[PDB]
Amino acid sequence: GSTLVTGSEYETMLTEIMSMGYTRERVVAALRASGNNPHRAVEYLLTGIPG
C-alpha cells in the first residue's frame, strides 16, 4: 500500500536531484517546500518556489 517515504528513499531522492547540479542545501530546501514530492521539488529548483 501507500506509505510514507523512508529515510533511505529520501536520501536517494536527495542525491538523485543533486546529480542535476544542485547543492545539497538547495535540494533539501526544495524537498521541504514540496513535501518530498520530487516533481515539485525539481520544478522549484528549475523555475522557483511559489511566490
mmCIF file of N, CA and C in Angstrom:
data_model
loop_
_atom_site.group_PDB
_atom_site.id
_atom_site.type_symbol
_atom_site.label_atom_id
_atom_site.label_comp_id
_atom_site.label_asym_id
_atom_site.label_seq_id
_atom_site.Cartn_x
_atom_site.Cartn_y
_atom_site.Cartn_z
ATOM 1 N N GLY A 1 0.797 -1.213 0.000
ATOM 2 C CA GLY A 1 0.000 0.000 0.000
ATOM 3 C C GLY A 1 0.832 1.267 0.000
ATOM 4 N N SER A 2 0.158 2.417 0.004
ATOM 5 C CA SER A 2 0.843 3.703 0.010
ATOM 6 C C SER A 2 1.337 4.012 1.418
ATOM 7 N N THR A 3 2.650 4.148 1.566
ATOM 8 C CA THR A 3 3.274 4.507 2.830
ATOM 9 C C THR A 3 4.070 5.796 2.657
ATOM 10 N N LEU A 4 4.522 6.346 3.781
ATOM 11 C CA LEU A 4 5.413 7.496 3.744
ATOM 12 C C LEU A 4 6.790 7.060 3.252
ATOM 13 N N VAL A 5 7.480 7.974 2.567
ATOM 14 C CA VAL A 5 8.835 7.682 2.118
ATOM 15 C C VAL A 5 9.706 7.377 3.328
ATOM 16 N N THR A 6 10.624 6.439 3.165
ATOM 17 C CA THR A 6 11.571 6.110 4.216
ATOM 18 C C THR A 6 12.778 7.043 4.146
ATOM 19 N N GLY A 7 13.563 7.046 5.222
ATOM 20 C CA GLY A 7 14.748 7.882 5.249
ATOM 21 C C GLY A 7 15.712 7.554 4.127
ATOM 22 N N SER A 8 15.903 6.265 3.846
ATOM 23 C CA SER A 8 16.824 5.879 2.783
ATOM 24 C C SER A 8 16.293 6.303 1.422
ATOM 25 N N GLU A 9 14.975 6.230 1.233
ATOM 26 C CA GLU A 9 14.384 6.688 -0.021
ATOM 27 C C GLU A 9 14.498 8.200 -0.156
ATOM 28 N N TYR A 10 14.388 8.925 0.957
ATOM 29 C CA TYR A 10 14.621 10.365 0.928
ATOM 30 C C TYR A 10 16.053 10.670 0.516
ATOM 31 N N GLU A 11 17.023 9.952 1.084
ATOM 32 C CA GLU A 11 18.422 10.226 0.765
ATOM 33 C C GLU A 11 18.724 9.949 -0.701
ATOM 34 N N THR A 12 18.158 8.871 -1.255
ATOM 35 C CA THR A 12 18.373 8.589 -2.673
ATOM 36 C C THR A 12 17.695 9.642 -3.543
ATOM 37 N N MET A 13 16.530 10.127 -3.118
ATOM 38 C CA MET A 13 15.885 11.226 -3.828
ATOM 39 C C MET A 13 16.751 12.477 -3.780
ATOM 40 N N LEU A 14 17.289 12.787 -2.603
ATOM 41 C CA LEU A 14 18.134 13.962 -2.436
ATOM 42 C C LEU A 14 19.365 13.882 -3.322
ATOM 43 N N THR A 15 20.074 12.755 -3.281
ATOM 44 C CA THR A 15 21.283 12.624 -4.088
ATOM 45 C C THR A 15 20.963 12.574 -5.577
ATOM 46 N N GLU A 16 19.825 11.986 -5.952
ATOM 47 C CA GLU A 16 19.452 11.935 -7.361
ATOM 48 C C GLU A 16 19.231 13.337 -7.918
ATOM 49 N N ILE A 17 18.528 14.190 -7.172
ATOM 50 C CA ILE A 17 18.296 15.556 -7.628
ATOM 51 C C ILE A 17 19.592 16.354 -7.607
ATOM 52 N N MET A 18 20.439 16.114 -6.607
ATOM 53 C CA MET A 18 21.734 16.778 -6.564
ATOM 54 C C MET A 18 22.555 16.488 -7.812
ATOM 55 N N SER A 19 22.397 15.296 -8.395
ATOM 56 C CA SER A 19 23.151 14.948 -9.591
ATOM 57 C C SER A 19 22.769 15.809 -10.785
ATOM 58 N N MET A 20 21.660 16.544 -10.709
ATOM 59 C CA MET A 20 21.339 17.517 -11.743
ATOM 60 C C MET A 20 22.216 18.761 -11.662
ATOM 61 N N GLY A 21 22.982 18.919 -10.586
ATOM 62 C CA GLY A 21 23.869 20.053 -10.444
ATOM 63 C C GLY A 21 23.389 21.074 -9.436
ATOM 64 N N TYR A 22 22.770 20.604 -8.357
ATOM 65 C CA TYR A 22 22.281 21.462 -7.291
ATOM 66 C C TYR A 22 22.942 21.051 -5.988
ATOM 67 N N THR A 23 23.251 22.034 -5.148
ATOM 68 C CA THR A 23 23.883 21.739 -3.872
ATOM 69 C C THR A 23 22.903 21.021 -2.952
ATOM 70 N N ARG A 24 23.462 20.286 -1.988
ATOM 71 C CA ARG A 24 22.630 19.572 -1.026
ATOM 72 C C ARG A 24 21.693 20.524 -0.294
ATOM 73 N N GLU A 25 22.207 21.676 0.138
ATOM 74 C CA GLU A 25 21.383 22.609 0.899
ATOM 75 C C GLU A 25 20.174 23.069 0.093
ATOM 76 N N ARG A 26 20.369 23.364 -1.195
ATOM 77 C CA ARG A 26 19.257 23.820 -2.023
ATOM 78 C C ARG A 26 18.225 22.722 -2.229
ATOM 79 N N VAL A 27 18.675 21.492 -2.474
ATOM 80 C CA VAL A 27 17.735 20.403 -2.718
ATOM 81 C C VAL A 27 16.936 20.088 -1.456
ATOM 82 N N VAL A 28 17.593 20.109 -0.293
ATOM 83 C CA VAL A 28 16.877 19.896 0.962
ATOM 84 C C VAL A 28 15.771 20.929 1.130
ATOM 85 N N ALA A 29 16.072 22.196 0.850
ATOM 86 C CA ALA A 29 15.060 23.237 0.964
ATOM 87 C C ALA A 29 13.939 23.027 -0.044
ATOM 88 N N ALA A 30 14.280 22.626 -1.268
ATOM 89 C CA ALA A 30 13.252 22.395 -2.275
ATOM 90 C C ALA A 30 12.365 21.214 -1.902
ATOM 91 N N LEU A 31 12.963 20.135 -1.391
ATOM 92 C CA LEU A 31 12.173 18.973 -0.993
ATOM 93 C C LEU A 31 11.252 19.313 0.170
ATOM 94 N N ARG A 32 11.717 20.150 1.097
ATOM 95 C CA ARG A 32 10.846 20.593 2.180
ATOM 96 C C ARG A 32 9.685 21.425 1.637
ATOM 97 N N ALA A 33 9.987 22.379 0.749
ATOM 98 C CA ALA A 33 8.940 23.209 0.167
ATOM 99 C C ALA A 33 7.920 22.377 -0.602
ATOM 100 N N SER A 34 8.339 21.235 -1.141
ATOM 101 C CA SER A 34 7.475 20.396 -1.954
ATOM 102 C C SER A 34 6.842 19.251 -1.177
ATOM 103 N N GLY A 35 7.156 19.099 0.104
ATOM 104 C CA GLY A 35 6.646 17.957 0.845
ATOM 105 C C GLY A 35 7.151 16.624 0.339
ATOM 106 N N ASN A 36 8.406 16.580 -0.109
ATOM 107 C CA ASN A 36 9.044 15.363 -0.602
ATOM 108 C C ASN A 36 8.410 14.846 -1.888
ATOM 109 N N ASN A 37 7.777 15.742 -2.645
ATOM 110 C CA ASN A 37 7.330 15.447 -3.997
ATOM 111 C C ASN A 37 8.484 15.822 -4.914
ATOM 112 N N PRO A 38 9.189 14.857 -5.513
ATOM 113 C CA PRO A 38 10.359 15.222 -6.325
ATOM 114 C C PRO A 38 9.998 16.040 -7.554
ATOM 115 N N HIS A 39 8.800 15.856 -8.105
ATOM 116 C CA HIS A 39 8.401 16.623 -9.276
ATOM 117 C C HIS A 39 8.261 18.097 -8.942
ATOM 118 N N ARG A 40 7.619 18.415 -7.819
ATOM 119 C CA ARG A 40 7.513 19.809 -7.410
ATOM 120 C C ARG A 40 8.863 20.359 -6.967
ATOM 121 N N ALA A 41 9.676 19.533 -6.302
ATOM 122 C CA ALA A 41 10.989 19.992 -5.867
ATOM 123 C C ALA A 41 11.853 20.385 -7.060
ATOM 124 N N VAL A 42 11.858 19.560 -8.105
ATOM 125 C CA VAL A 42 12.632 19.895 -9.294
ATOM 126 C C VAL A 42 12.052 21.125 -9.976
ATOM 127 N N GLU A 43 10.724 21.225 -10.036
ATOM 128 C CA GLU A 43 10.103 22.419 -10.599
ATOM 129 C C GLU A 43 10.537 23.670 -9.846
ATOM 130 N N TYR A 44 10.575 23.597 -8.518
ATOM 131 C CA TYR A 44 11.007 24.738 -7.726
ATOM 132 C C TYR A 44 12.475 25.064 -7.974
ATOM 133 N N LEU A 45 13.312 24.039 -8.143
ATOM 134 C CA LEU A 45 14.719 24.283 -8.430
ATOM 135 C C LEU A 45 14.916 24.857 -9.825
ATOM 136 N N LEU A 46 14.078 24.462 -10.785
ATOM 137 C CA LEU A 46 14.230 24.933 -12.155
ATOM 138 C C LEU A 46 13.670 26.343 -12.337
ATOM 139 N N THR A 47 12.477 26.611 -11.797
ATOM 140 C CA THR A 47 11.770 27.850 -12.101
ATOM 141 C C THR A 47 11.320 28.616 -10.866
ATOM 142 N N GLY A 48 11.701 28.177 -9.684
ATOM 143 C CA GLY A 48 11.489 28.977 -8.498
ATOM 144 C C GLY A 48 10.373 28.443 -7.621
ATOM 145 N N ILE A 49 10.484 28.720 -6.325
ATOM 146 C CA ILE A 49 9.481 28.303 -5.351
ATOM 147 C C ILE A 49 8.270 29.218 -5.480
ATOM 148 N N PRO A 50 7.118 28.836 -4.931
ATOM 149 C CA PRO A 50 5.931 29.699 -5.042
ATOM 150 C C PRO A 50 6.174 31.076 -4.438
ATOM 151 N N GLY A 51 5.700 32.099 -5.140
ATOM 152 C CA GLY A 51 5.911 33.472 -4.728
ATOM 153 C C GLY A 51 6.607 34.265 -5.818
#
